[PDB]
Amino acid sequence: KVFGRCELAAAMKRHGLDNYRGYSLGNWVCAAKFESNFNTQATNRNTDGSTDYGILQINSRWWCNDGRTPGSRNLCNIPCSALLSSDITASVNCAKKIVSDGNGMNAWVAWRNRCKGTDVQAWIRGCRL
Ligand code: NA
C-alpha cells in the first residue's frame, strides 16, 4: 500500500504516535516519507545480511525475525513479515520500542538525513487532524 501523507498521519495518530516520547506527528510522517516513500512493502537488503522492512524500514539484525539474519535478535517479538502489512500496527508498536532504545529517532538514517532539524510540521500541513 502506498499511503497518502495525511492518511498516514491519521493512522499514526490513532496508534498513539503524536508526541510519543516527545516526537511530533510530523517527525513520524517525515521519517516514513524518506525511509519508504510511504510504501508499506518497502524492503532493503543490507550488505551485512540484515534487511530493512516496511514503511519505517525496521532492521532485522535487532528488531524482527526473518529467519536469515545473523545475530540475531527479535526485540519487537514479531516476524519481519508483520512489518510489511498494509496496516501499520506492527510497525508502530515496534517503532515505539526502537525510539525508546537510546538513540531516539536517530535510529532512522533517512530521518537524520532529511527530517532532523527541519520544519517537520510541514509534513502535517493541511491534515487538520
Ligand atoms: Na543526505
Could you write out the DSSP letters of every residue in 80-112? GGGGGSSS-HHHHHHHHHHHTSSSGGGG-HHHH
Domain ranges in the chain are 1-129
Catalytic residues: 35, 52
DSSP code of residue 124: G
Is position 18 annotated in a ligand binding site? no
Q: Considering only the top CATH level, what class is 1-129?
A: mainly alpha
User: What separation in Å is there between the alpha carbon of 120 and the centre of ligand 1?
Assistant: 16
What's the gap in Å between 112 CA and the centre of ligand 1? 8
Please answer whether residues 8 and 38 qualify as being in contact, where contact means their C-beta atoms are separated by less than 8 angstroms. yes
User: Which grid coordinates are listed for 36?
Assistant: 519508504
Distance 37 CA to ligand 1 centre (A): 15
Give the span between the Cα atoms of 39 and 52, in whole angstroms: 13
**C-alpha–C-alpha distance, residues 46 and 42, integer Å:** 13
Number of Cβ atoms within 10 Å of the Cβ of 116? 16
User: Residue 65 gets which letter from DSSP?
Assistant: B
